[PDB]
Amino acid sequence: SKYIGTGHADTTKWEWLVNQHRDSYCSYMGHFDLLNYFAIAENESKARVRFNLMEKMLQPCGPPA
Amino acid sequence: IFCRKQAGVAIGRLCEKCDGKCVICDSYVRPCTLVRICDECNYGSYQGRCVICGGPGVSDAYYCKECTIQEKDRDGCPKIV
Amino acid sequence: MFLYNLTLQRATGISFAIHGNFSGTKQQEIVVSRGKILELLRPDPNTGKVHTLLTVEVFGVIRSLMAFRLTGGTKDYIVVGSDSGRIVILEYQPSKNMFEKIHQETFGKSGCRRIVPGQFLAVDPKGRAVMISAIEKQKLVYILNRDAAARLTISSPLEAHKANTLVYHVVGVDVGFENPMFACLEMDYEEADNDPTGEAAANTQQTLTFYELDLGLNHVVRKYSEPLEEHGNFLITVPGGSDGPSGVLICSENYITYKNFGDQPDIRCPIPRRRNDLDDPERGMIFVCSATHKTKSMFFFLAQTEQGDIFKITLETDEDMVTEIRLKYFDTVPVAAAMCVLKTGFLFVASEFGNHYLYQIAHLGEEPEFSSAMPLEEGDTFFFQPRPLKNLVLVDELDSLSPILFCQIADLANEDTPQLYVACGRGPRSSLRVLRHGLEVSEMAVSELPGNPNAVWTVRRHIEDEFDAYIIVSFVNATLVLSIGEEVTDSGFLGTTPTLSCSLLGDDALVQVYPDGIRHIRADKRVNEWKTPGKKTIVKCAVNQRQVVIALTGGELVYFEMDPSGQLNEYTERKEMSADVVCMSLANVPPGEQRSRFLAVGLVDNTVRIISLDPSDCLQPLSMQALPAQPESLCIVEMFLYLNIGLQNGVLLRTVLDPVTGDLSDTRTGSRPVKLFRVRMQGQEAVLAMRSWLSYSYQSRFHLTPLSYETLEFASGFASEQCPEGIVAISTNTLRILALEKLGAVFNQVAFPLQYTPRKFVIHPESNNLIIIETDHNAYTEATKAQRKQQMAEEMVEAAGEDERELAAEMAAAFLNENLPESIFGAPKAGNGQWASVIRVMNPIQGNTLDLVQLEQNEAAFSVAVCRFSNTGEDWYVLVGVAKDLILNPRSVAGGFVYTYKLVNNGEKLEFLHKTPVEEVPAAIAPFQGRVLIGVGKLLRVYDLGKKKLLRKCENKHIANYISGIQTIGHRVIVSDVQESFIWVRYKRNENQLIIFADDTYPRWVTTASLLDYDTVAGADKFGNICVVRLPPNTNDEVLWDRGLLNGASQKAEVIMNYHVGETVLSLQKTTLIPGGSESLVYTTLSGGIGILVPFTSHEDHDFFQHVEMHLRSEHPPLCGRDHLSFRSYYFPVKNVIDGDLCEQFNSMEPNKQKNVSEELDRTPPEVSKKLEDIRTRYAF
Ligand SMILES: [Zn+2]
Ligand SMILES: [Zn+2]
């Protein structure tokens, strides 16, 4: 309940997925190789990949329903 | 009810009756990770008191191997209050 | 069944780099993170060259690093943020050569978690506090101080948490001796989660927030916060106190801004852009990294843009206030993960990918200097011209394999030892690199000898000489005396007769040994001579800087020692051996001793025997050993004393030397009688055995690595003006002077440049040529780059109306002819969804391009195969799978194509045959039973060749998601799904059907797959794991009412192995890395790491390394505080793998801990080290 990320009976689809996406982007920012993978695939600088991920943290799934 | 605040540099203690016991799960088996407590729990009159029951404290409190494996040592100050 | 993991080549990529006096001595060092590994580097300011002092596997993810220093201290600490939930402080200890963990403060649960601190790490510039923070919510502040014993002490954490708040970056603010302050780029997402219109999300401003730690009230206050006009990606600490105006520099898209609290106005400067930039005009520009350089008088920042261009940034001040930022273009270098300025005037550049660089800073910056104070129009920009290096001089390049995208172990060069063919790099810094086990040899001089040469020796003229003075050469019937450049007869009074040895007899003297006798030569013109008594002759000899021993016909041994005046004196005692002497060796004397103790003598007896030459026990035997065969040769050496033995057979031997010889080890080393010689390497004594091999020590370990060079027959050490440390060697007539380029590296690499990121390659079987497909997103083809440049030139002229058109035409003509190399200046970034791709046929022996096909703009090659088709029999065809107009995020594609070429002219040319359209990306192509399988998105198809198109002959529609790869044995097909891991498909010929018969029970994000056997697959995934999946016995492959099991296939593969490697693995290959060695599973990582997994052969071995791993997990815990078992169990519980990288930590431990652990194992430490070496030497060096 106090831990951000935990759910309960009234958790919506949107809330759960926004958790998955914010949690994924944090994993990407930490796992240097997974970040390497994305930077090479996009043909982009690591710094820009991190910046793009931070930008995506704000509203990763589009607006709430 | 555990305090669950940020663990400090202060080390948890156990009274004679509650010794050997893991704070989180009462096991007498394989003490492993040294217990840390929040400053407020170590403060003043509370200096050196038992984490489990508030007794005079004679020994260092530990999380057992299972609690260590489960990262239950990470939840924060385990003084029962 | 049971596997052991070993790293061969450690990760070469760098994620973090920090500066300090980690030794505490005035010399500056670099600590670098390689993600999974911490490493300390010393750049030598004399040579301008980088040495690795220390490497440690930390068995966790280093997420951040800082250096810090306590006020009044002299040594820098490393503070590490990691996926361990604990802030760790390390001190480097030069004496022990190790990182010592000073503190480990625990605060949370492990893993790279969103709300647990570890990502960002910031220090008070005066060392008094460190903040460690997460991406969301939690920030913790630890106060640092020293005790009465001057040991570092750390407080309880003070929290500074804030709900719903993202952190982009944090830095400490230099405030002098005022209360420590941390600046955070923060954004609050609360409103964005509450507004269904999306208005709030777009109206959300990132803020700069300053947290003050009150040392006197022991809490953290969020003292100031202010919104920013545009989002910053990172912060730079500006020097304060008496060193500057403090504050912070926010780097943001297209801008750099200076902010400070108080009456300071915001100063903002746009980032200058390259004149006539071919990039997409819609792309904004960020700084990607920065370095700060401080000096008594002044400071400046270097900040690098995405394009690789470095700007020198400086601040102009009036009183305390900054008044303007001034940017000057500095130089362009590859895009950097980190830049660090050494006080000695060097710039280290840890490249994002590829090799790293050390540059000497030749100048500190006619070039125009841009400023915030300059008037600039709305939507306008400053412009600068990129050019070649002007302030920086390259002094060292650190060869790194990151990223490895495709590797293939094969003997394409016919060397009877396969080479690792690796497709590395990214963009225009891509390469194919051929890796070969051994040291890199350089010829410093070359010559040829007449007739039949048989031996060679090297000598000084005085012990004080910086270099040798003579080379003595031998032939079956003669000898020859040469200079260190040419025959020299100045002080060379050498005999013409065949020779056993030539050497330095004493401080100013030389000796020659021949079957008749011994000739003594002085530097001054005086010759003394000795002859063999009776009818006997000399057969073998041994020497030291003040002593001689000889072995005669019948095995009689005779000894001589130098008296103070400088003359040999024959000893009174003579001893005969039990058998004929085959070889001898004598230890080199310590510099504070007149004589050397230990003689070794090898016999036809198949024994080696140790004798003293000391007058207390002269010619007395000390100890002896029996051997597998007759010796060829011997050599005693220190690093600590060892005897080395070469046999007439190709099996080498090492034993520790004492009055009783201790433990020993042996290895195949080859077939020819093993000949041993002394050499000098990195200033140390070492031995050369002859593949040729150097035996030496590095990182407290011992190495026997071959030389990647020709067959050599005799050799000796060398020092000269032409070659300061090296070898004189002979191969047949060849007379070469040879030098060794590197000590610690296990592979030497040749690099063949490529144009775009190589996605995959295959080897044409009948010619060994590589068909490489290279592909970049955000990229122009050559054709498109030309067209874009033409229209830019036309537009540049059309922009002018007056007589300025003459100048505009000149500028346009210049621009059309300027050709800044992509490998230096970066390939121009085309927009999103833009692709450039080529198919290249290159010879692997030397990387000449035999053919180059360029694909159309926005065609991206993703798969390639080489095969025959049964309908045509003999011809070879290259099939390349291409996506058209693929958009990565969000995923969308305009279909794809499979291009078919026939490969002609003995594998040298691609004759285009036809292009076949497909509905989705043909992501995998696999030759199969004289046809080809193609994975077209989620569809698996069998295609035959036809004439005008490939012809679909079978299809399966039941794979879950996108097919990422295909492998086959017999009638079996193994499909990698992008997420749903492995699906087993059987092709049935008569029915003409592809039937799914088994699948995995776990999601795996498969990146690569290797078939181990007919029932077993090794997989890698995107999350740094390896697994092995096996079909359980009696799995049947001969197969609305059907539902299957758990919404998948009726039969399930069983995971028999799980292991978190720590790095993303893009290749796996079952192969033997050494001739006559055992087979292993080689894997390559994105970070440029190479390792193996190898099966244990038996219970006893398995059980032993399991017990070693269990004891090391507890007694030698991972440096940065992560549980080893938890790390290896990152995504799935570790199963049937022992970490040999943990086991080999045994050799790094303090000897008391080695004793404790070996006692627990019922062994002694030498036996443990022997077992560690024995496994790592059976499967791969
Ligand atoms: Zn108690
Ligand atoms: Zn417990």
Swiss-Prot record, chain A:
Its main location: nucleus. It comes from the Eukaryota. Keywords: Acetylation, mRNA processing, mRNA splicing, Nucleus, Phosphoprotein, RNA-binding, Spliceosome. One of its GO terms (cellular component) is precatalytic spliceosome. Residues 1-61 are annotated as: Interaction with SF3B1 and SF3B3. The record marks G5 as: Interaction with RNA. It is found in: Nucleus. The keyword Phosphoprotein applies. GO terms for biological process: mRNA splicing, via spliceosome; positive regulation of DNA-templated transcription; regulation of DNA repair; regulation of RNA splicing; U2-type prespliceosome assembly. GO terms for molecular function: RNA binding; splicing factor binding. Component of the 17S U2 SnRNP complex, a ribonucleoprotein complex that contains small nuclear RNA (snRNA) U2 and a number of specific proteins. Part of the SF3B subcomplex of the 17S U2 SnRNP complex. SF3B associates with the splicing subcomplex SF3A and a 12S RNA unit to form the U2 small nuclear ribonucleoproteins complex (U2 snRNP). Within the SF3B subcomplex, interacts directly with SF3B1 (via HEAT domain) and SF3B3. Component of the minor spliceosome, which splices U12-type introns. This is Splicing factor 3B subunit 5. It comes from Homo sapiens (Human). The lineage of its organism: Eukaryota, Metazoa, Chordata, Craniata, Vertebrata.
Swiss-Prot record, chain B:
GO terms for biological process: mRNA splicing, via spliceosome; positive regulation of DNA-templated transcription; stem cell differentiation; U2-type prespliceosome assembly. Zn(2+) 2 binds at C15, C18, C50, C53. Keywords: Acetylation, Activator, DNA-binding, Metal-binding, mRNA processing, mRNA splicing, Nucleus, Phosphoprotein, RNA-binding, Spliceosome, Transcription, Transcription regulation, Zinc. Residues 71-74 are annotated as: Interaction with SF3B3. Zn(2+) 3 binds at C22, C25, C64, C67. One of its GO terms (molecular function) is zinc ion binding. Component of the 17S U2 SnRNP complex, a ribonucleoprotein complex that contains small nuclear RNA (snRNA) U2 and a number of specific proteins. Part of the SF3B subcomplex of the 17S U2 SnRNP complex. SF3B associates with the splicing subcomplex SF3A and a 12S RNA unit to form the U2 small nuclear ribonucleoproteins complex (U2 snRNP). Within the SF3B complex interacts directly with SF3B1 and SF3B3. Component of the minor spliceosome, which splices U12-type introns. Within this complex, interacts with CRIPT. Interacts (via N-terminus) with U2AF1 and SRSF5; acts to bridge the two. Belongs to the PHF5 family. This is PHD finger-like domain-containing protein 5A. It comes from Homo sapiens (Human). The gene is PHF5A.
Swiss-Prot record, chain C:
Residues 193-231, 759-777 are annotated as: Interaction with SF3B1 and SF3B5. Component of the 17S U2 SnRNP complex of the spliceosome, a large ribonucleoprotein complex that removes introns from transcribed pre-mRNAs. The 17S U2 SnRNP complex (1) directly participates in early spliceosome assembly and (2) mediates recognition of the intron branch site during pre-mRNA splicing by promoting the selection of the pre-mRNA branch-site adenosine, the nucleophile for the first step of splicing. Belongs to the RSE1 family. Residues 105-119, 145-168 are annotated as: Interaction with PHF5A, SF3B1 and SF3B5. PANTHER family: DNA REPAIR/RNA PROCESSING CPSF FAMILY (PTHR10644). The gene is SF3B3. The modification Phosphothreonine is found at T1164. InterPro entries: Beta-prop_RSE1/DDB1/CPSF1_1st, Cleavage/polyA-sp_fac_asu_C, RSE1/DDB1/CFT1/CPSF1, WD40/YVTN_repeat-like_dom_sf, WD40_repeat_dom_sf. GO terms for biological process: mRNA splicing, via spliceosome; negative regulation of protein catabolic process; positive regulation of DNA-templated transcription; regulation of DNA repair; regulation of RNA splicing; RNA splicing; RNA splicing, via transesterification reactions; U2-type prespliceosome assembly. GO terms for cellular component: catalytic step 2 spliceosome; nucleolus; nucleoplasm; nucleus; SAGA complex; spliceosomal complex; U12-type spliceosomal complex; U2 snRNP. GO terms for molecular function: protein-containing complex binding; U2 snRNA binding. Pfam families: Beta-prop_RSE1_1st (PF10433), Beta-prop_RSE1_2nd (PF23726), CPSF_A (PF03178). This is Splicing factor 3B subunit 3. The record marks G284, E306, E352, R426, N889 as: Interaction with SF3B5. The core of the protein consists of three beta-propeller domains. Keywords: mRNA processing, mRNA splicing, Nucleus, Phosphoprotein, Spliceosome. The record marks N961, K1135 as: Interaction with SF3B1. The modification Phosphoserine is found at S156. Gene3D superfamilies: 1.10.150.910, YVTN repeat-like/Quinoprotein amine dehydrogenase. Its main location: nucleus. It comes from the Eukaryota.
